[PDB]
Every structure is written in structure tokens, then in C-alpha cells.
Symmetry: C4
Subunit: 388 residues, 4 copies
């Protein structure tokens, strides 16, 4: 009925509780589960759902062979009920393509999918399940977007896109949509040197995005957006607790306005919540590969270049595979504050598990608690040997 406004602050995050888990690869060993990757979670006013990019085959299907590849004509943004797996029979297609974002503005949902060949890709912006706007590639090098939910305020839903090199300067733009129409766009500003795969959340009329500098940085770039003024800025997380992957060992002092060097041309989508002393960072446990996952409480990470952990929680053990991670919240929940949430993609199959010819994932997701809760670890749980 009305556009949602970001009128609340974050709840105090004292730990993380289990929210959803689909066990998709376990279940899909003997049921019609679609192969996916690049999952996320997004809420409507009356339901929260899982989202991902399908590969247009089931996991036991012979067409699962080759699904390490990111971009084909067989991919689509799908959604399905929370903690169910993405099946052929329960998955709803939001739009067609191989990079996406989606968010609800309080009245209805906007979904964006990009498709095409590398040098001629286009975004289609859907609103109320109809296409409304299209945007052609501006740099002819894999036009691409967040791979997790966007955020709206009074109808304005900003979205970050990048077109251009993954290993050098690229052209990043912030589009401000309303009802699927372009109100404005701006080129990236501030000190972030490279942006991909922004993970965003909204509180007190400001949207914060934690992104991936694929080119040089092992610290994460941060974009902060004012959706009323339709302006933004950028920087890096100051903290020496480095949250990209792969990455060097953690130093004692980080960088606020430059990439922290030591690994080039690689990364992973990740997130954080940056809320002064209530600041929590996610990362892989391994510095070398996408294994394990942990949350660290790092007070003032955004602004304090010597900030270190005061608390933490293990989400996935370093002996289990992780993957992309991102933020979402239920903006329509009851109460006085928005409860921080996140997901972690649990990648299985190639390239790390190459006895199978496929790559897919399952999902785990948590939300914050004001209690100090006991921790478990949450692995995918499938046995690869069963698929041989």
C-alpha cells in the first residue's frame, strides 16, 4: 500500500541465530533440484524468499555438466519459498539472465536481470512482474550488478552496476529507480578504485553497500547512498581485519582510501554491517580459498584503521566450503529496529570438488540476536561420493 521508508536503526547484534537453510545439494541427490549459484534472500511485506541464478538443468541431469561456467542463455533469476530447495516445480522465474538484483519497495517488487554476450549485454528492469526499462552495455565488457537484494526508500531503489574490466579500471554507475523507471544515475565517486557485487542494507534513511574490489583490494570498498538526495560516496573499510578472498594475512593497520594490496584480480562477494560499535564483518576463514565462514565484531571497522575483533561467531568450519555472502533484512518486521541478516552460499562441485562435472550450491542464512547465543557450524552437508 505505501512505499517503505527506512525509519529504524539496526538492532544490537550480540550473536547470530539460524534463519534458513535449504540443504539443496543433499536433497537434490534424489529429487528435481535446479543447479544454481549466486543466491540471496529478499523479503516482501508478507513473505521472505530465497533467490538465485538457475543454470537451467537439474543437478542429477546430464545438462549439469559444464555448470562451472557463469554466463549462458540457460540462466534465470528464480525465487522459491524460504528454506525449501530450488526445484523445477516450486521455483518462480523473476527474469532471464546471468546477473541480478531484486527488492520490494513496499508496494511491489523490482527485479533486474542482465543477459547477452560479453560485449553486448543489457539489463531489463522489471516492476510488478512486467518489464519497464532497459539499459544497454556502456563499456562492452560484461555489464553486471549486485547478486543480492537492493534496498528502497520512499520508492527510490538504488542499484550498483559495473561494466568494464575485472582486472583494471571499470565504469561503475549508481542508478536510482522508482517504479522501474530511471530517476537518475551517477558515475561512481569517492575513493573506491573498483566495485563489484555490492551487498546492501538500509537504516535511518541511508543505504550502505559493502562490495568487492576485484582489481587490487583485499579490504572491501563501501558505498554509502542517500536515497533522498540521490547522492553517494565511497571508501574502503579502514580495519586491518581484511574480508575479501583470497587475501594476505591481516596487518595491524588497514587502509581507509586505497586498496589493501597483496592479491590482484580476484575476490568474492561479501558483506558487513557498519554501525559504530555495533559493527560486524563477515569473511571466509581461509585466506586462500572459499572455505569456512565467520562473523567478527569489529567496533568502528569503517572508520578505525587499527580496529580488531572484540567478539565473534563461526558460521561454517574451515573444513567446509563457503562462497558468496550478502546482506538482507526484513524491513516489514514488527518492533523498533531492523534485524541484520545475511546468507552464505555453500558451493559444491567444481572447481574444488572435480570428481563431479557440475557446480552448484546450497544456502545458509542467519539473523542477529540481542542474546549471546551458542554457536553451531552450518555446512552444506552433501557427500560428493554419492554423486559419483
Amino acid at each position: 500500500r505505501d512505499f517503505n521508508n527506512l525509519t529504524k536503526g539496526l538492532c544490537t547484534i550480540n550473536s547470530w541465530h539460524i534463519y534458513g537453510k535449504d540443504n539443496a545439494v543433499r536433497i537434490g541427490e534424489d529429487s528435481d533440484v535446479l543447479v544454481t549459484r549466486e543466491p540471496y534472500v529478499s523479503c516482501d511485506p508478507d513473505e521472505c524468499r530465497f533467490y538465485a541464478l538457475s543454470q537451467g538443468t537439474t543437478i542429477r541431469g546430464k545438462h549439469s555438466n559444464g555448470t562451472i561456467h557463469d554466463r549462458s542463455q540457460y540462466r534465470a533469476l528464480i525465487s522459491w519459498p524460504l528454506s525449501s530447495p530450488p526445484t523445477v516445480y516450486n521455483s518462480r522465474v523473476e527474469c532471464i539472465g546471468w546477473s541480478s538484483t531484486s527488492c520490494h519497495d513496499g508496494k511491489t517488487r523490482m527485479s533486474i536481470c542482465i543477459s547477452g554476450p560479453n560485449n553486448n549485454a543489457s539489463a531489463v528492469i522489471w516492476y510488478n512482474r512486467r518489464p519497464v526499462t532497459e539499459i544497454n552495455t556502456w563499456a562492452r565488457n560484461i555489464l553486471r550488478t549486485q547478486e543480492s537484494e537492493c534496498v528502497c526508500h520512499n520508492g527510490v531503489c538504488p542499484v550498483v552496476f559495473t561494466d568494464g574490466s575485472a582486472t583494471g579500471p571499470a565504469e561503475t554507475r549508481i542508478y536510482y529507480f522508482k517504479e522501474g523507471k530511471i530517476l537518475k544515475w551517477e558515475p561512481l565517486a569517492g575513493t573506491a578504485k573498483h566495485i563489484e557485487e555490492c551487498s546492501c542494507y538500509g537504516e535511518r534513511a541511508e543505504i550502505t553497500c559493502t562490495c568487492r574490489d576485484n582489481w587490487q583490494g583485499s579490504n572491501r570498498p563501501v558505498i554509502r547512498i542517500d536515497p533522498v538526495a540521490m547522492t553517494h560516496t565511497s571508501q574502503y573499510i579502514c580495519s586491518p581485519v581484511l574480508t575479501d578472498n583470497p587475501r594476505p594475512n591481516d596487518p595491524t593497520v588497514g587502509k581507509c582510501n586505497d586498496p589493501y594490496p597483496g592479491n590482484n584480480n580476484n575476490g568474492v562477494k561479501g558483506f558487513s554491517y557498519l554501525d559504530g560499535v555495533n559493527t560486524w564483518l563477515g569473511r571466509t576463514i581461509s585466506i586462500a580459498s572459499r572455505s569456512g565462514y565467520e562473523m567478527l565484531k569489529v567496533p568502528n571497522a569503517l572508520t578505525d584503521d587499527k580496529s580488531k575483533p572484540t567478539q565473534g561467531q563461526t558460521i561454517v568450519l574451515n573444513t567446509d566450503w563457503s562462497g558468496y555472502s550478502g546482506s538482507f533484512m526484513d524491513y516489514w518486521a514488527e518492533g523498533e529496529c531492523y534485524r541484520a541478516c545475511f546468507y552464505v552460499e555453500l558451493i559444491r562441485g567444481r572447481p574444488k570438488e572435480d570428481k563431479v562435472w557440475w557446480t552448484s550450491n546450497s544456502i545458509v542464512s542467519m539473523c542477529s540476536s540481542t542474546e549471546f547465543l551458542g554457536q553451531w557450524d552450518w555446512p552444506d552437508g552433501a557427500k560428493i561420493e554419492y554423486f559419483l
Copy 2:
């Protein structure tokens, strides 16, 4: 609540963006996907869906053997959610038969299915999911209809049927339905010599249908219907850009009131949008078989017998299989103009791929953009070898 009226003109068509794609044959390699053919797309006021004729077996089922055949007691018009595949578990049966059409009038949906033996077929006209009217064969030779959506204006939904020879004169009728009841019917008039499988769209209170002259023409016949007066006329597309299949090579000058000769007794369902300079024609790329698919901008194709392409877009490469194609639009979208859409049926299996014993298809669909978007090609994507 109210009957929809065709009050808008076409949006300007500068390119085509991806709308839906089901990847059904890929997915159906290892899931309970129904064998189909003769698909299309049709919108309700709150949802757009895929439609097709089921063959009453799954593709991996042993009853898929023999599904090259067009007309059996096991066929039905089914619908399913946009870009999902047609599964046993998500497909809704609209009516029983082996030729169909369907459209929503703004209040509810009319669906028409024809069944029976060749010499004794009948149409049943369903409205609000109940049968209302029946029409018996008038020429005793495969009574048959559009195989894509009809169009309504203020409750009046015209439909084109043909009964009689596929390779000689036949008896074509235009029925004007309202609430599933016959208001009137007329015998075909104008200069079209043979009509099958009309593909129709509505704008500014007129309905335009691009059809298949199976007998003689490689140019397509066009029927234009005034749904208020309940009258029509017919002609051929004047343009030397010929759009049937198979067909001769394109000449320099076409025919406005006669079939363009060079192939007899064969054809394929196709479509066009005929809107002066905003005119786009679809066709197979091959002159000999149903391979490839392209859209050509041919200004004034309907009326200019020397009109040639000023722009185009490849939809399916000539090294991939195509099939039937047809028009639809979302008459209930927001904005000032109706956005042209189309689908292409991607036929797999027999007769061209005869290592399998079945014939089925998947679907790809696009809508127009006012941008000049980059093009991809959109093949079915299944590997036949997997099915051996």
C-alpha cells in the same frame, strides 16, 4: 472488472529484449516435463503465462514415442507460469484437444480447443473455465484455429478458424465471441487465398492478424479486423522480404493481393507487427527448413511492394532449430503504449533429429525496447545425445 479496450498504439520498436525462456527440453532430460508443441504466451490482468498443446506423456516417458503426430486424444491446451517448464505438477489444463486459442477479455479468459477425427472435429469454447458454446466441423477436413492468443475489445474476441484442404481452397471463418457466445461469424473476404494459424495483436481498436497461406504463398496473408463493426479484410504483406518457410529467395518486388509463388503445400505459423515505419517482420533464417530466427525492421512492409530491411536482430542462429512463432502483448501493462511481444517455438527431436523417437519444443520470448539493445542468440540448449 471492466472489458479491456484497445485504446493504445504500439510502442516504438528499436530492438527486442529477452522476456521469457523455459529451457524445457534441457530441464526435462531429468524431470517430469510434458511433451508439447504449438506453444504461445498470453496475459491476464495480473499474470502472463505460457500455453501449449501437451501430448499427454513426459519426454523421458516411453509414451513420448510417436509424438511427431499432431492429433490424438491425448492432447490438451495447458498453461503454466512464465518461464517455468510445462511439468506434470504445475501445468493447468484449459481444455481438451489438438488445436487451440485463448485470450482474456479483461474480466475473464476464453479458451477454445478443437478435437475429434479429421472428418468430424468440433470446437468447444470455454469462458471463465466453463464450456459455453460448441461449433461442429463445417467442411469435414480438420477444423483448426490460431495456435496463439486471440485479442478482445470491449468484450468482443474475434477468432479465425479454417476447415478444409491444407493444399487447395478451404473455408475460413471469423467468429466474433463475447462471453463465450457467438455474436456473428463471417466467411473470409479480401484477397488472401488460404489462411491458417493467425497470429494477432490489437492497437487503436483494430486487430491485425498475420497468418500462413499453406497452399501457395511464401508472403504471409494479413487479416485486419474491426471488432466494433465486426468486419474484416485481407491481403498479403506487399514486401519482397518473404516470411514463410520454406520459401524461395527474396525478390525485389513482392505481391500485395496474391500469393508469392515458388513453394506449395507447406508453411509455418509466423507473425509480424505492421505499424508503418515501426514495422517488424519475423522469419526463419533458412529458406528451406525451420532453422534460425530473425526480426527485420521493414518500413511499410504491409503496403510497399519494394520495402527492404533497415535494421534487424538475430533471435536464433541458423545452426539452431526454430519453429512456430506468434504475437502477444500485455494489454494490462502500465504506460502509454502497448509493447509488442513474440515467442518462437524451438522444436527438438523428430523429424530433423531422428535419433530420438519424440518431438517436443521449448520456448523463447521477447518484447520490444525503445532502446537499441545488444543482441544475443537464444537456442533451446538441450543435447540430443543425452537422450540416447
Copy 3:
């Protein structure tokens, strides 16, 4: 909102058009289709659905072995969308048991299922999907009911039950329910000597049921019920066109008040519409087995002991298997008259096809047309050899 009243007469029946067909055995060869028997069709105010008794296993499942048996703890009344097959994933359980009926009163639905051992069976009467009333066996010999829909008038839904011998006198009762509560019951009256499996329809505030005299009659008993007075009578169809199975050859003169002899202790559920000159009878084509199915127009069949066919329609060829048949109508359709409908159960597997270890069926259904439509035949269509 209001209880439906039977205020209309039957439409004129000049032929029969296809209404629904599920092709369940064909589809179930390679999908999760439940084994059933004793199907029927019943309408709500906004939807019509297929109903049957599940056997609590899929057809390809190993538990399909033994499903020739009628009565087990694994059976349930299920419903599913019209012309879909009865799948594990789309079938809704109405109640538990091995004999049933169901009807909608205009406000909500009553469903009745009987379960138990032969000598200690009970009916549970569900209303608005909650159990309301229970009725214990009165004769300790397979309490049993219609196996097709009941009919309501101003909230009163009569139902016919039988308890006692299948091959001798039994105790038949007519229960008058309202909101799932017993208003009254009466013992069978009139001249019918044995009653099973009544097939009923409603018009002009009277309900007519055509039943099965399993003991002696090859003519069918008829019960006529006044749901306002809550009284009834019974007789047999007078016509020499005999409609049970198995049966003797047709004579020239039938019996109005006694069973027509020649076969004992056997029969099949069937139906008719008895409406003076607008009278149509269904029967198997074979006198010996459940093969084929036809509709015969037999003017005044109910009252004229020499009435013979003036018109007919083949539904299933005598070279294809049939089974139970029954009546239903869409009481909530638009227009001035109720359109007669029926289904035929197409039994496959045992005992006639004993290369498989199972018994199941599919469904075909038709409704009347005021046109004289061409006829097709409508077989199950599955190849038993595929299941070996």
C-alpha cells in the same frame, strides 16, 4: 454465500462434447502418479475437480502390487485439478477410507468416507473440511456409498448408503444431511430390490439417482428424491435397452418394477439422465465385460417398457477398457439450464491385463451440447507393454 437451489431444468442434449481427460496411466508411466480407482467429478462454485480413491502408492511404485483389492487402510478420497492426473504432489486428501461421496451445497463441501473391516465399518461425514458426524455399520457387511457426487438443495444433501449382502437383500438407507448433520434417514422404499453406487443429478427441486442392482437386475434401479419433503421412491428403468454389465442381450420389452434377470451377483456403477424425450442412457458396449462405452438417446426410458434408441454416441470403442461411470453437473454455471455431464473410469491392469501386478484407471468426461457434434472415441491410451 447462499445454499444452492435446483431451480433449472436440463439443457437439451443433442450430443456430448469432451470436458476433461487426465491421461493418468500414460503420464504415470514416468511420473509420480497415484494409483486410483472409483473416480468421479464434482464442482464447487468456482472450480470443478476430479476425485477418486487413492491406493496410497504410485503406479510405478512397488506397492502398486496388489491394488486389484478394493479395501485397505491405505486408501483415501483425493481430489485434484480438472484434467491433471492424480499426483503425489497435487492431490488433496478429502478424508480416509475406501468408499466415498462428496458434494458442495453452495456454501461449502461435504465429503463422506467409509473405512474399517468388513464387519465393523463406519462413515465419517466431513463438512468445511472438518469431521462432523459419524455413522456406524448397521448390517456388519461392508457399509458403502455412491462413489460419485451427491447433490444438494437449500442445504439438504441426500446420500444413499447400503450395508449388507452384495448377492441377496441388503439394507439401504437414504440419509438427509445439512451442514454435515443428520436431519433424517429413511429405509429404501419402492420396487428396487437391491441398490449400490447411486449416480445422482438435480433439476427442478428433485434429485434422480441411477444405481446398480448387483443381486439380480441388468436393468438399473432408479431412486427419485424430494429434498424438500425428504421423501423418495424407487423403481427400475422400464426400457429394454439394458445398461448394467454384465447383462443379457437386449429384449423387446423391459421391466418397470422388477429386476430384469439373466445375470446374478455382478454389475457396474453407471448412470442416466431421465428427462422424458430428452433421456440418455450410458452403458458398456460389451454385454460380457467392461469394454467400450456408449450413450443412447432412449426417449422415455424410465416409463416406456418398449423404448428403444433414437440417437447415439460412441464414447469408448469396444476394443478399449471402460469401467464405472457417473453423473455430475456444474450447478453454478451461467445460463438457463443445467448441462448434463458424466465421466467414465478407464480401468487398466488387473484383472483383464494381468501382465502387470496393479490395477488403476484414468478418466474421461463429457458434457451435453445442444449442437449435433461429431463423435470421437476416447481411450485411456497407455501401452501396457511399457510397464513390463
Copy 4:
């Protein structure tokens, strides 16, 4: 719209009629049925559903190997339509974990799931399908709850939890929730010495729970809760008809305020309805293992230490496997009294049937009748040999 109040008494229980049965293990032999255990039934105002703890694999899936284990990261509370089986495609996840409860307060549903390692478990309390409250382990030894529905009165839904030893004193708490928030909690009081797995029902503004004393008692502890005062008491069922399993032979005189000795450190979840002369107890038929199931009418069982059976009903034969059992009622049914209902979990596979590597169950459920109905027995019905 309004919170439900427990304003009715129990209906008179003269027998039990069949309510639901899913036949899940039979069906799951050849369909995508999830492995479960710890099932129950719970009603909303407009629907009643089956609930259980999934094991996050199908039964025919290779991940079914190991599902004898109770607590893993792959478990979730799921619900599905009454008498359907718990499939991958129709099951809705309520929350994540390995111990649960759920109930509807008349406005919306509260669901509670506990997860974590044995020494660090936490409960998350969901309301209106959103997490609201979290509760950390207080004794660091398998925090755990009812495994059947809770009950609400004017918004207050008490829930019994236990944390601590299964074979010695433990710390049991009664939490009083409203809208998912903690109003109050109390430590267990009265004479019950050990509490697990309470099975609860509501009548005349009091909630009665029949639980499992795993430590010493073969008589069942009873907790009675006043949800207005938010106080409770506890005792044991006085009757010498002992209802735990395993258990000693029945004596002539029971114990009201102490555990009845003879078996230690073991038990099974069970239930009763304690309503003076209208008192019925459920139990396994075997004293040694979870086989068979029966209901006994034991007047004044709660308060009369010599009460013996005056009537009974066999539910499952002693030659068939049983399991957990629990109470529920449809608080939103029509009429003057609440109809007592229960389910029995039918465990198949390990440990008793160790030719398979899995453990799962199906469900049977009954409700009371004021008739004296005939009895059947209701086994799971699957053949283990089919799974070899």
C-alpha cells in the same frame, strides 16, 4: 482476527474415528518424500496440517543413510497438507532445528525450533513467520521441547522446555509467550521428577500436558497450566494402567506423586485426555518396544490410583511398529465442545528394521466420536523388502 479462548469442554469420547493418514513410507518408495521423525498435527483457523522434523534428504536418497541420528544441521520443522506425505515440493519450512513446537493463537502461528550442538543449543521463537525471541541453553545439555503442538488462551501460549540430563534431574521451564515475546517463565513445580516431550490440550481455560519422565517413571507426569494466572502444577497419572514405554507389567495400584519404577533411562512421547469419567489413555501394546497402539478408557485415571479400563480401542496391532504419540484439537471447529484428537508416529527402519540404513515414519491420526464406532487397525503399510 481475535485471540482464541479455551471456552469449551471436551466432547464425550465414546470411540475414535480415522482423521488423517499419509502413508508416507509406502508412497516414498517411488516419489520424493522427505525422511522425517517426531511428527504432529496442528490446526489454524482455516486449515489443519501435518508437522514433523525433516532430516533434509529423501528416503530413497543416499543421504537417508544415518537418519537414525536425532540431531544434525540438516533438520527443520516442516508442515504440509493433512494426509499428504511430506514431499520436497509441498513441504513448508517453519524454522530450522531438531526439536520443535508450534501453535496458532487465533490471529497467527508461533513456531519454535531449537538447534545447536549439545552443549550450546538455542531456541528461536517465530511469530507470523518471522523470528522474534531467542533463548540460550541454560543447562548446556540438549535444550529441548514438546515435539507436538502448544496451546494458546487469549494470546498466551505456554510451552514446556527441558535442558539437562535425560537420566537424572534436569531443569524444566514453562515459558509463557504472547506474540512471540516472553511474558514470564517459571521453573517446574509439583511432584513430577523429570519432564520431556509434553503433549498438551486446552479446555475450560486450563491447559493439560501429559509428558515423559525419562529418568524413572513408567507412569506419565502431568502438568496443568492456568494460562491466565500463568501458574502451573505437576503430578503423575495415579492409575495403575501404565502408559510409558518400555515399562513393567501393570500393577493394581499406581503412584500419584512419584515415578512408578521398573524401567530407567528410557521412554516414549505419549499423551492422554484427563476429564473425569471421560478419560482416555494412549499406550503402546508392547511393554518392551514401540509396537502396537491402543486407547483405553480409564475413568478418573489422573486421580484414582486403582482405576482400570472400562472400554478400549486398538489403533495399531502389536505386530506393527508405533512410535511417538501426541494430542491436538481443532479449536476453531463448530459446535459446543472440543473434539479430542491424537496422532501416532509409525516408525520404520532403524533400529528395529536394520536391513535399511534409514529411519523414517508415517502418520496416523484419529479424533473422538460420540458414537460407539467399529475399530480397524492402521499400520504404516510399507514393505521394507521393497527398499532393499
